[PDB]
Design a protein around this ligand. Structure first.
Ligand SMILES: Cc1cc2nc3c(=O)[nH]c(=O)nc-3n(C[C@H](O)[C@H](O)[C@H](O)COP(=O)(O)O)c2cc1C
Ligand SMILES: Cc1c(-c2ccc(-c3ccccc3F)cc2)nc2ccc(F)cc2c1C(=O)O
Ligand SMILES: O=C(O)c1cc(=O)[nH]c(=O)[nH]1
Ligand code: NA
Ligand code: NI
Length: 351
């Protein structure tokens, strides 16, 4: 029930623990399955895969692939693992996670705390068989690849992620947004796609680029330009923002890092519209940023998203939020004339 979690449970956990401790606890609980129907309307085919429902869990929750199965159990149409780095790295010194309850927002500067490719690969291979079945059933797995803080070759770091986890991923994600020109971007992504095309004995995973909501007009044109030029399979809009919107009440708003949650809701959707227009609706887009209801989800899809993802909403509303968003999205699609989710993609631009 939505009320119990929002009014009591989540608030209870927030007074007993600091955000990073709660995050780790959330992962334990989710991976153990101490948790507990998708219509055909929500089914989305894109990126060469089938998704029973368009609501996935965004990268950052399960950084080391410890709770994949638990996440699907919570109702997610797809799971995106970590932001995994080649070598293990501790990340920024603590505290590095801050709660903004009144804003239904969070601010983090984790710095890519990661177990590493070796560990995540081992874990994911251990369940490769189960995931194979999951994928076949419209529950794809995404893997977000990062790079080490001290690494010298960014492209080499990502490429290594493609080789090690490409065989295990349904789709891969390269960041360029965690809180440089059109040429440096083109070289990085071409080497990644080349490594992807070099894979064998495995189904080639789609490659998407995740961008920040903090981009200049030139940044968006360049990203759109390179994406179409290289044939990027998609884009994830949007990642956290460094800006602090006028109206933030949280006492920790002055904290450095990326802001997620409701404050990022519309900035995320507007970026989706802009990127969708710059790519002429030719590049599938996964919309993320402040999704907390079916309606927020529909606004992202109409702006141009084929799929959406959420994270912060789960932090304050808990598991029930996943069920509520899907239920509302379905009800709204009907009410607004769309026979399927696919029909609403890019509806804003079509007028
Ligand atoms: C605590 C935290 C950790 C995150 N870690 C990652 C990460 O490792 N890699 C990544 O690509 N995005 C990361 N993100 C960003 C989310 O994937 C997402 O882009 C952003 O939070 C917007 O969605 P939301 O408002 O629904 O949370 C993180 C976000 C939060 C709040
Ligand atoms: C409470 C919380 C949780 C969480 C989410 C879901 C659950 C959960 C999951 C499954 C079943 C029951 C539950 F309560 C438990 C705990 N995850 C986070 C992740 C990142 C972050 F920065 C902060 C948090 C915070 C926080 O406010 O400190
Ligand atoms: O680990 C992190 O700091 C991090 C990475 C990223 O892509 N986004 C975010 O909000 N935090
Ligand atoms: Na526009
Ligand atoms: Ni694969």
């Amino acid at each position: 029930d939505d009320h119990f979690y929002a009014e009591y449970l989540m608030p209870g956990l927030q007074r007993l623990l600091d955000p990073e401790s709660a995050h780790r606890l959330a992962v334990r609980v989710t991976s153990l399955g101490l948790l507990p129907q998708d219509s055909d309307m929500l089914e989305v085919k894109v990126l060469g895969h089938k998704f029973r429902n368009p609501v996935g869990i965004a990268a950052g929750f399960d950084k080391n692939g410890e709770a994949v199965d638990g996440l699907y159990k919570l109702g997610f149409g797809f799971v995106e693992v970590g932001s995994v780095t080649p070598q293990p790295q501790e990340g920024n010194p603590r505290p590095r996670v801050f709660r903004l309850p009144e804003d239904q927002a969070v601010i983090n500067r984790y710095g890519f705390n990661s177990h590493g490719l070796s560990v995540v690969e081992h874990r994911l291979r251990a369940r490769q068989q189960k995931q194979a079945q999951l994928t076949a059933d419209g529950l794809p797995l995404g893997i977000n690849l990062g790079k080490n803080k001290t690494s010298e070759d960014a492209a080499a770091d990502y490429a290594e992620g493609v080789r090690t986890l490409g065989p295990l991923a349904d789709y891969l994600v390269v960041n360029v947004s965690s809180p440089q020109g059109k040429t440096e971007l083109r070289h990085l992504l071409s080497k990644v796609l080349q490594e992807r095309d070099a894979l064998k004995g495995t189904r080639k995973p789609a490659v998407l680029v995740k961008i920040a909501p903090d981009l200049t007009a030139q940044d968006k044109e360049d990203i759109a330009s390179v994406a179409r030029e290289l044939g990027i399979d998609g884009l994830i809009v949007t990642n956290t923002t460094v800006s602090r919107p006028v109206g933030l009440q949280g006492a920790l708003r002055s904290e450095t890092g990326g802001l997620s949650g409701k404050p990022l809701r519309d900035l995320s959707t507007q970026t989706i519209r802009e990127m969708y227009a710059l790519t002429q609706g030719r590049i599938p887009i996964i919309g993320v940023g402040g999704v907390s209801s079916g309606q927020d989800a529909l606004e992202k899809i109409q702006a141009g998203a084929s799929l959406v993802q959420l994270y912060t909403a789960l932090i304050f509303l808990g598991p029930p939020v996943v069920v509520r968003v899907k239920r509302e999205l379905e009800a709204l699609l009907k009410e607004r004339g769309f026979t399927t989710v696919t029909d609403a993609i890019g509806a804003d631009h079509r007028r």
